[PDB]
């Protein structure tokens, strides 16, 4: 599923990401926009053999099992395919565990490089919330 900006903002608000670990909703929408362009089926193969999956491009090295990342973990205890569903529940729950790590939203490279320090509230501007 390919979300619209305000449609995802509402879906993410409904699943508790607004101010989760102190990160306002706009941070989450901005991160999803640049990680996946709001596409739940987005995947990106990394040079270490791992793959990033879903709306927030969650990586198989630590967070999910895809059966093809040599030396990996599955801390969200899910198959990586669960991060590609039209229902964003699994992606939100695993994102909650990632952001609870010592590095917070810095875990998402696109968030750190394109969202952090910006006027992120602009990402929820004009949205039904
Ligand atoms: Na894994
Ligand atoms: Tb850590």
UniProtKB/Swiss-Prot annotation:
Single GO cellular component annotation? endoplasmic reticulum
Q: Which reaction does it catalyse?
A: Hydrolysis of (1->4)-beta-linkages between N-acetylmuramic acid and N-acetyl-D-glucosamine residues in a peptidoglycan and between N-acetyl-D-glucosamine residues in chitodextrins
* Residues the record marks as active site: 35, 52
Q: Which residues form the C-type lysozyme domain?
A: 1-129
The residues listed in the UniProt record as binding substrate, with positions renumbered to this chain, are: 101
Tissue distribution: In the egg white and polymorphonuclear leukocytes.
The protein's location, in the record's own words, is: Secreted
Give the GO molecular function terms: beta-N-acetylglucosaminidase activity; identical protein binding; lysozyme activity
One BP annotation, GO: cell wall macromolecule catabolic process
| InterPro entries reported for this sequence | Glyco_hydro_22, Glyco_hydro_22_CS, Glyco_hydro_22_lys, Lysozyme-like_dom_sf
- Main subcellular location: secreted
Superkingdom of origin: Eukaryota
The disulfides recorded in the entry are 6-127, 30-115, 64-80, 76-94
The protein's matches in Gene3D superfamilies, at most eight in alphabetical order, are given as: 1.10.530.10
What are the EC numbers? Answer: 3.2.1.17
The alphabetized UniProt keywords are:
Allergen, Antimicrobial, Bacteriolytic enzyme, Disulfide bond, Glycosidase, Hydrolase, Secreted, Signal
Query: What would be one Pfam family of this protein?
Result: Lys
As for family, the record states: Belongs to the glycosyl hydrolase 22 family.
The job of this chain, per UniProt, is described as: Lysozymes have primarily a bacteriolytic function; those in tissues and body fluids are associated with the monocyte-macrophage system and enhance the activity of immunoagents. Has bacteriolytic activity against M.luteus.
Q: How does it assemble?
A: Monomer.
- What else is noted? Lysozyme C is capable of both hydrolysis and transglycosylation; it also shows a slight esterase activity. It acts rapidly on both peptide-substituted and unsubstituted peptidoglycan, and slowly on chitin oligosaccharides.
Q: Would you tell me the protein name for this molecule? A: Lysozyme C
Give the source species. Answer: Gallus gallus
Organism lineage string: Eukaryota, Metazoa, Chordata, Craniata, Vertebrata
């Amino acid at each position: 599923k390919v979300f619209g900006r305000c449609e995802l903002a509402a879906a993410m608000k409904r699943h508790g990401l607004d101010n989760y670990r102190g990160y306002s909703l706009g941070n989450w929408v901005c991160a999803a926009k640049f990680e996946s362009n709001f596409n739940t089926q987005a995947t990106n193969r990394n040079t270490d053999g791992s793959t990033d999956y879903g709306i927030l491009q969650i990586n198989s090295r630590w967070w999910c099992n895809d059966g093809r990342t040599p030396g990996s973990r599955n801390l969200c205890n899910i198959p990586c395919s669960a991060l590609l569903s039209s229902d964003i529940t699994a992606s939100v729950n695993c994102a909650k565990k990632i952001v609870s790590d010592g590095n917070g939203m810095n875990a998402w490279v696109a968030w750190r490089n394109r969202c952090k320090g910006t006027d992120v509230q602009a990402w929820i501007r004009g949205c039904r919330l």
